[PDB]
């Protein structure tokens, strides 16, 4: 088939550079990878092409630019690679944390998109100097492809003025824009759209609330199909308990510690958001998977962290269930512990059984799978209980060919692909059916979508 | 009668002495009052004694030994006083703000006490040490009385792990105490053993949810009788919006902002305790009633702000019924906004509604007094609403008085006055019945006791 509609989307962190391939008109993956410790010694990619075996190779990247290059040879290579030459590409995606509220969706940067960025990195400080150096080192490798912004903080941009400000110093919100934000905007725009499609309901109609919890961890109440309230905050420290983070906590506690410690902003703030969370409460955990292998071996902090994980949920929860106005349709869960963290999900919904949510044990112990999205509630349960495995590359593929097409908008204008009952993802499929010859009763919970056939 | 089983009551800040001088065995409130600017030049009491003018006087207090020594000068004066002389007082409650995890209950101060507290007073550097200073003071007055600390932290120790941790560094809990503590314990205590007789029911099988909301304002959750979470955090700044105080922030908003600004943490802590809250977001008001008047005038800000506090009391009711694991018995509004804000009340019911809340707005109306006990929930709604005027100043008297008897305990295993249903303040009875006068319809909302007669 024609195999030249294929869009890149790259992730550049301070020390890496994460890719996927993704071709458009043969909706496929074609592959994903990491450059490891980019700007440092011992720079190395993992390359992961469809059908083949992981390919390992060090190369040196003291800059993005290197590592951006290191990309494109490997997707060029005859024996390793995946597309014939650099020119098989037509646009590419970058992840940007933040864009404060100068930006409301993707775009297609230039040199005054450029500009406009740089007037809000100072709020994403820890994140965006790297999504921009990716930008620039992007351009100069395919210097003849839109470059594509797709930003974090943009799905939460139809936040009303009652959620989004602090109880602050107006000056604060006019002179430097402070205000929550909120990040995982992909997930929950990706999710949101699927909930819409699995409850056979326009988006506009949809009233939900979304946990993406992964090793970053928040919560968005979706309210008439947009973003109406989200845990984390001015930054991704505030909200729901991480990996590393601290989520939410007294604002004055910093404080007292720094006057305890000797600590300043910068060491206090990485503190927070590096030693903190998981981590900080068990002393040396940050997987989901070992606080509770640690819990089942009796480790008390283990067993403390998990349940603050659960009961700041369940909080959380309850405040959105509240912020709706009214039941929501459905929860969802998503992002590595919401698809696989099946405890988690059990201790959080079982203390919310009186607000509507009812989970079957049985269905949540089937959902342990990247692979399906599954309702894993009773049957009769007021409130529906989704897992949606989230796609924030599909999200990020489809803003940067939609804005290359020059059809692209925000969410309550622009129609995507996976708003069709009929969408499909194929590499989750052929997974499907291999945990489907292990599991078989997997097959009992996959959601059946209204329209689909 | 006798006169001479009489307790006095402090509360003392850096610049103001508050007063209560309270008969036990008339059960009657003698006087009360402030001295004010203490410590500065024209420090000056103001003393209401039962039944007679408001009595003010000028006199310096360069100490508050001095505003003591005003204070007692003033209770036994012939023609003002309402105490033959000193000895009539036989013992003394003070105000302490933070006990830390040290102090489960009220306690008789003696100098290994006074230790303790100074190795808590870190964790309250704003409150205790003016609240010490008046103990010493006292102490130096009132020599031959137990001198008693009625501690704001204490009620809220039932509070377990997983409610008072922050997921932080163990070695920050272990090393300097850091945790959540929430203050208004006192008020708690009161209106959540007034709602339990009101409620015709023992403590301990009582599950209900109340907002002290005043110029500081938290919320308690109490799960069978006890605190259960609280939203004030290691300091009062955590939580609700409050007339200066910021509530609930991104931790590393404060980081983002002194960067910009140049503000040290001393600093910062005081604009988030002084500056912010409903004074930040209008520019120029702290109370309440200036918020609603000037939202009826069409102020933009003002209407923000009073939506602001409404959204997140919504927020963390729906938190707080998530985590008592079922349908709360009631929910308790108390202090001034919480007894007067009508406004605020059925603002954040209405939102409520599908949470089992149910306001009547006439009832609502009518509940705008200090002087009675409300039901102001429609007759049929799942969860009570009762509106509750506090009385911090009873706890604090009683304390002292049972921990001079030495019957005192913790309220798991002590029993107040207030908690028989036959229980009557006196001074709010009066003044009932000149509301009575004036709005007779209020008659028809104030609570029905089961048992009481
Ligand atoms: N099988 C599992 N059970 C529980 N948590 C998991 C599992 N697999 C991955 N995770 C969590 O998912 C996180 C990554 O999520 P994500 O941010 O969605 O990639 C990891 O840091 C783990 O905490
Ligand atoms: N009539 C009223 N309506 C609304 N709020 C009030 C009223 N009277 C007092 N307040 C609020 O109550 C606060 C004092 O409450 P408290 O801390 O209980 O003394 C004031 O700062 C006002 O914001």
């Known amino acids: 088939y024609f195999q030249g509609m294929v869009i890149l989307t790259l992730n550049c962190g301070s020390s890496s550079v994460k890719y996927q391939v993704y071709d458009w008109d043969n909706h496929s993956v074609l592959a994903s990878g990491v450059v490891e410790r980019v700007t440092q010694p011992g720079s190395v990619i993992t390359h992961e092409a469809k059908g083949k075996d992981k390919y390992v190779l060090e190369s040196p990247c003291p800059s993005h630019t290197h590592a951006v290059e290191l990309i494109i040879k490997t997707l060029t290579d005859p024996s390793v690679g995946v597309i014939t030459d650099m020119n098989v ?47 620039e080192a992007a351009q100069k490798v395919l210097p003849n492809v839109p470059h594509c912004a797709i930003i974090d903080t943009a799905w939460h941009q139809t936040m009303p003025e009652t959620s989004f400000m602090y109880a602050i110093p107006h000056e604060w919100y006019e002179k430097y824009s402070a205000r929550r934000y909120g990040f995982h905007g ?78 300043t902003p910068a060491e206090m703030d990485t503190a927070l958001n ?34 603050m994980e659960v009961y700041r949920l369940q909080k959380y929860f309850g405040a959105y269930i509240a912020a709706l106005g009214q039941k929501p349709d459905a929860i969802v869960f998503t992002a590595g512990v919401g698809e696989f963290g099946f405890d988690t999900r059990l201790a959080v919904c079982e203390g919310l059984t009186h607000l509507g949510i009812k989970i079957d044990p049985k269905k949540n112990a089937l959902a342990r799978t990247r692979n399906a999205e599954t309702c894993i509630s009773a049957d009769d349960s007021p409130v529906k209980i989704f897992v949606i495995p989230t796609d924030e590359e599909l999200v990020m593929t489809e803003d940067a060919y939609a804005l290359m097409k020059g059809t692209y908008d925000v969410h309550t204008k622009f129609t995507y692909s996976f708003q069709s009952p009929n969408y499909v993802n194929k590499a989750r499929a052929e997974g499907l059916k291999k945990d489907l010859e292990k599991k078989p009763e997997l097959a009992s919970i996959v959601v059946k979508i209204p329209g689909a056939r």
Chains 1, 2 share one sequence.
Not at 114 to 129: A, I, S
Not at 284 to 289: A, E, T
């Open 89 to 135: 590409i037509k646009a590419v995606g970058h992840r940007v944390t933040h864009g404060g509220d100068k930006f409301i969706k993707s775009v297609i940067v230039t040199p005054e998109i450029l500009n406009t960025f740089r007037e809000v990195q100072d709020l994403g400080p820890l994140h965006n100097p790297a999504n921009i150096m990716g930008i």
């Open 186 to 263: 992909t997930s929950f725009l990706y999710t949101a759209k699927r909930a819409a499609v699995i409850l056979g309901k326009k988006p506009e109609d949809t009233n939900i609330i979304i946990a993406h919890i992964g090793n970053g961890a928040s919560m968005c109440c979706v309210k008439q199909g947009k973003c109406f309230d989200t845990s984390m905050g001015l930054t991704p420290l505030e909200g729901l308990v991480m990996g590393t983070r601290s989520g939410d906590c007294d604002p004055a506690l910093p404080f007292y510690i720094m006057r305890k410690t000797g600590m």
């Open 274 to 307: 590096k030693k903190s969370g998981l981590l900080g409460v068990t002393g040396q955990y940050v997987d989901r998977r070992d606080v509770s292998k640690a819990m089942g071996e009796g480790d008390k902090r283990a067993r403390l962290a998990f349940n």
